[PDB]
Curated annotation (Swiss-Prot):
Changing K17E: In PLGD; common mutation. N-linked glycan contains N-acetyllactosamine and sialic acid. O-linked glycans consist of Gal-GalNAc disaccharide modified with up to 2 sialic acid residues (microheterogeneity). The gene is PLG. Residues 1-77 form the PAN domain. This is Plasminogen. The modification Phosphoserine is found at S546, S637.
Amino acid sequence: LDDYVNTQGASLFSVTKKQLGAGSIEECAAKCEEDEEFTCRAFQYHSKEQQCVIMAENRKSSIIIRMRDVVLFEKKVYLSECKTGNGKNYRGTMSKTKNGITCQKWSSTSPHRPRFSPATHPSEGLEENYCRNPDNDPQGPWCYTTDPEKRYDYCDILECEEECMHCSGENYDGKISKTMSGLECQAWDSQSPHAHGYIPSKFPNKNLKKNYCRNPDRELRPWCFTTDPNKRWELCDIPRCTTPPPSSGPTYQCLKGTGENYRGNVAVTVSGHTCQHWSAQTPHTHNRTPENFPCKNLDENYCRNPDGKRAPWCHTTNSQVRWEYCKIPSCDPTAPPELTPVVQDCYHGDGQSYRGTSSTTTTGKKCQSWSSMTPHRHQKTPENYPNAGLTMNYCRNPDADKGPWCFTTDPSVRWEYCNLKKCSGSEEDCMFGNGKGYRGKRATTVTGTPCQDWAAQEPHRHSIFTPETNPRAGLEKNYCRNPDGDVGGPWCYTTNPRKLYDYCDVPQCAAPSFDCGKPQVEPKKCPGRVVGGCVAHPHSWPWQVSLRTRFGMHFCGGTLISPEWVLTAAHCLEKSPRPSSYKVILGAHQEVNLEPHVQEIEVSRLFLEPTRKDIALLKLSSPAVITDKVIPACLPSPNYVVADRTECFITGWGETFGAGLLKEAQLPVIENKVCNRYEFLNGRVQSTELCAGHLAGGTDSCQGDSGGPLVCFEKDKYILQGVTSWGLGCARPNKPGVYVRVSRFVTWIEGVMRNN
Ligand SMILES: *[C@@H]1O[C@H](CO)[C@@H](O)[C@H](O[C@@H]2O[C@H](CO)[C@H](O)[C@H](O[C@]3(C(=O)O)C[C@H](O)[C@@H](NC(C)=O)[C@H]([C@H](O)[C@H](O)CO)O3)[C@H]2O)[C@H]1NC(C)=O
Ligand SMILES: [Cl-]
Ligand SMILES: [Cl-]
Ligand SMILES: [Cl-]
Ligand SMILES: [Cl-]
Ligand SMILES: [K+]
């Protein structure tokens, strides 16, 4: 199944097809390789129905429609518009020669009579008028031309990035799993021996498969994390292709937009200064080299825009001016913010009326924008559905499904139901999450159709999901169960012979207490662009602590992690060596003019981290009362590394608009590897440290309070990922802030709370 591209919840419209019963995907794949009546380009497998659909079409020739109980598997060769070697196995759609002449059909005998046709060579894929290599020609794929004067000619086809690489290897698809020094690559899905933020589920379009060398972070060339415990990562020796790189789109010798497509010959700045050659390091040293930007055309000293600036620019030959924009003669999309409500949104009926900001699925996947056709091509547009409210990447129900859904950013999963509950307005008859462990008595589908018994084989026959085949699944009578971890939750086979299965609405079990990282007041979610942050909504960060002096002044921040425990920075408690000199304020919004019902607790014990890091544990003299305004924060799993580009929040009062009020600021997490680059922190950031802030457009201020929280949203809650420490490094211009990585101290924190 390495020769296939899989997509869950995807199906195509097929004319040339063959349907048959199959027990597995592998069994269905074997029938596709057989090629009985036609050449199988894709197959569909229905796990609950045990049905196998073999097809002659794929996404290039057929329309994609979302469906339940389906995984679409497409043969990689029929999707790849590139060649490997002499293009013997090439199956792309290039239908013109290297000189622009349209190809003749392999089945046609006019203007030329073929020597190679589907009749003479049936295993050579001589389809339509596509360029092919059926005669082992060393010059590569060719075609018979429509020109009667030219019998046949070779075609210009891009080389696959399998044997070699183009540019920086950002689109490298080869199988090299060894570094330049001979170390074995660590699998991208693995967090051992090295914990990292390049999580494939968080970057599903970056092709981080197995332990292959990849370039997901604009590095010089593909690299990987190593299996050696002492070497975190290393570059790979990937060969460069000798053939031209992929097309960067239309090129203009005049200014258009930002000038990223500008390829003119202007070698003078806006102030008349002579441009410094991109290949030169005098009088100015830089990393905007042809080696770092190989497909950006940094040739000679011509004005270019490789790093995404305002207009095409160049370095200056004058020692005083480093760089300046160029006066080029003019000629006449990013990821949306995380606005998923932490106070879980609800839907009425089928959720067609739902207009909330949720963009999270039941498995924690990110919703694709309705205006976007990538990674999933669809027709669910605001033009086709004007009353469905298909705005941004929000969870909606345009085609009247059981509940709100969205297309996912994961190319291997077309769509998923959203993480929303049915509005409330047997109590024990409830479930947790998707309800795999659910053993209740509900047997009513969303449509009202009665459930078929699990042991029953009529109207639907099934060799899977019977009490004998799944004995730990609790498949009793016709009760709605989730034995396969279905996204839509518990389901049952239906008594309707026209409907295989259907979902049953099972409510979520009510939380008996205020669980960690779940505020009772929805956070404002201050946009990242905002200067000096925003004033937080009162009680939207219930774990926020105010460390107070014996004269009642707020000096430091902190996080409530347990009713008797507060996590802060060691720097905060440097001045005084007594826990009696510090007091903890909980459920506050005001820095000075504290509102009534705020919790004031004395500190009884202080625990400093043994490896001398800027992190400290405070034991409260009495346990804090957990209310709707005072809730602890969740701690991450030991050594967890927050994914790169993850938007996090830093909260506190700070030193000062909104005087003496609790503030918040959104910061993107920068992976230690990117953070440790010579242009930024230059190898100073250790595994015990976290990088958050902007690499371009720095605020130039020590944000929040010292010891303050850094929380990151994950599916349905906020997890404490960092502790504010100004000593490590403040948010400078073009330099991110350095925070204490909480996950590296979780084992120590757990030990202290357990034994004290
Ligand atoms: C991508 O990242 C940048 C930060 O680097 C965010 O600002 C950006 O949001 C959009 O940023 C642009 C500025 O470039 C505008 O502020 C934008 O608004 C508009 C637009 O004119 O581009 C307004 C328009 O009404 C929107 N359409 C709606 C609401 O239906 C479009 C639309 O959202 C966008 O074109 C889709 O790409 O945007 C901010 O949306 C980040 N991108 C997103 C989608 O948030
Ligand atoms: Cl669809
Ligand atoms: Cl991605
Ligand atoms: Cl207050
Ligand atoms: Cl690193
Ligand atoms: K690069």
